[PDB]
Amino acid sequence: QSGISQTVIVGPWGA
Amino acid sequence: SGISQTVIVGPWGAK
Amino acid sequence: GKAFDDGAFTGIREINLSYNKETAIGDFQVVYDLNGSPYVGQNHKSFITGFTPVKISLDFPSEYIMEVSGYTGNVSGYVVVRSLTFKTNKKTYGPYGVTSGTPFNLPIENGLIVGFKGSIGYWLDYFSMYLSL
Amino acid sequence: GKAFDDGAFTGIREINLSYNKETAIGDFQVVYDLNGSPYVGQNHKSFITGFTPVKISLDFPSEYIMEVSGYTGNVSGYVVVRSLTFKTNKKTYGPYGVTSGTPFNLPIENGLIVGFKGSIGYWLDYFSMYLSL
């Protein structure tokens, strides 16, 4: 749908 | 090589 | 334990596992998607019996796992995976097993679980997950 | 805290962080790789000062992070990342901070951390990591 490339993102950790 | 790759996360459990 | 490695697929349709409320995770099997067809992964069986089965049937493709979490700890002198919880965009399945020991979690902000690998003896010893966009 | 999001790059060259052994992780700045050149990321600072600074200078490109782990706990009413440890194929850096509370970890079997996002107030509230082949 858009011209921005994407990437796998894991998380968040913390809180 | 001619084998495709994939991100793998882990392991969780026994080290 | 006995090693398994399903490899990577297009998605996940169903997870079938077994657990015992006094010990840990036992059997583990996944129905993946492979380009729109269900791919019945091999049933990775515990070496022992006495578990409760669960079938986690996902409404693929609209429903998908966003966080896997669980506990690891001692059972019979071995470090194993005690409990698992699968949280999708639609609901929470689990916890299954025993929720004590060391917590772990893999939340995903972007991407998909596409595969599992690991080792099962009496209990699920460890596992890893393949991730894809 | 204040959110940040560095986005994705091609690798990690250097991590600059700070911590205090009575409290938690404070500041965070990454020097990324961008197609074989260094890219100095935004420096994400705590609202307060007093932390001890740490520079983790990686032997890029041969050295790379294989596992990030840490503890989450309550500090003065804030639930925050109290410690961080970065394990590479060469060595372990840390733990920095206070190893007390709820543990977490991200072990990687295949792939690279290529970016960080999160939130920092008085301390690092939470973070996530971009992963790529």
DSSP A1-15: --SS---EEEEEEE-
D104 and D87 in contact (C-beta within 8 Å)? no
Region of residue D103 (phi > 0: left; psi between -120 and 50: alpha; otherwise: beta): beta
Residue type, D23: T
For D:20-59, CB contacts with A below 8 A are none
Nearest CA in chain C to A12: C107
CB distance C109–D103 less than 8 Å?
no
* D121 three-class SS: coil
Asked if the Cβ–Cβ distance from C131 to B10 is below 8 Å, we say no
CB contact under 8 A, D106 and C106: yes
Q: What is the CATH number of domain D1-133?
A: 2.100.10.30
Q: How far apart are CA C40 and CA C56, in angstroms?
A: 14
For residue D36, give both structure tokens: 């074989």
Token pair belonging to C39: 């791919």
CA C109 to chain centre: 19
The structural domains of chain D, with segments of one domain joined by +, span 1-133
Distances (CA, A) of D124 to C89, C104, D97, D100: 27, 19, 11, 15
DSSP state of D51: P
Judging by DSSP bridges, how do beta strands C78-88 and C112-120 pair with one another?
Answer: unpaired
Q: Which of C118, D66, C126, C84 is nearest to B14 (CA)?
A: C126
Reply yes or no: is the peptide bond before residue D107 cis, omega within 30 of 0: no
3-state SS record for chain C: CEEEECCCCCEEEEEEEEECCCCCEEEEEEEEEECCEEEECCCECCCCCCCEEEEEECCCCCCCEEEEEEEEEEECCEEEEEEEEEEECCCEEEEEECCCCEEEEEEEEECEEEEEEEEECCCEEEEEEEEEC
- Per-residue buried b or exposed e for C106-119, using 16+ beta carbons within 10 Å of the residue's own CB: bbbeebbbbbbbbb
Alpha carbon separation from C90 to C66, C69, D37, D76 (Å, rounded): 10, 16, 42, 35
Q: DSSP code of D35?
A: T
The size of chain D, in residues, is 133
Q: Do A15 and D126 touch (CB under 8 A)?
A: yes
CB-side neighbour CA atoms (13 Å) of D88: 20
Phi and psi at residue C89, to the nearest 5° = -60, -10
Residues of chain B in contact with residue C106, where contact means CB-CB under 8 angstroms, are 9-10, 12
Resolution of the PDB structure in angstroms:
1.7
Report the alpha-carbon distance of residue C71 to residue B13 in Å, rounded: 8
Query: ω into residue B11 within 30 of 0, thus cis?
Result: yes
CA distance C64 to C62: 7
Interface contact flag, D109 B9, Cβ < 8 Å: yes
Structural contact between residues D1 and D119, judged by C-beta atoms closer than 8 angstroms:
yes
Is A9 in Cβ contact with D128 (below 8 Å)? yes
- Best mutation target, B4, B7, B12, to test chain D (most D CBs within 10 A): B7
Looking at chain D, which subunits does it touch, using at least 3 CB pairs closer than 8 Å as the criterion? A, B, C
* Cα→Cα distances D26→D8, D51, D76, D81, D84, Å: 22, 6, 14, 9, 11
Distance from the Cα of D59 to chain A's closest Cα (Å) equals 24
> What span, in angstroms and rounded, lies between the C-alpha atoms of D65 and C7?
23
- Do C86 and C70 meet the contact criterion of CB atoms below 8 Å apart? no
Amino acid identity of residue A13, one-letter, is: W
Q: Tell me if C105 sits within 8 A of C67, measured CB to CB.
A: yes
Of C133, C128, C127, residue with least CA distance to C112:
C133
CA C133 to chain centre: 20
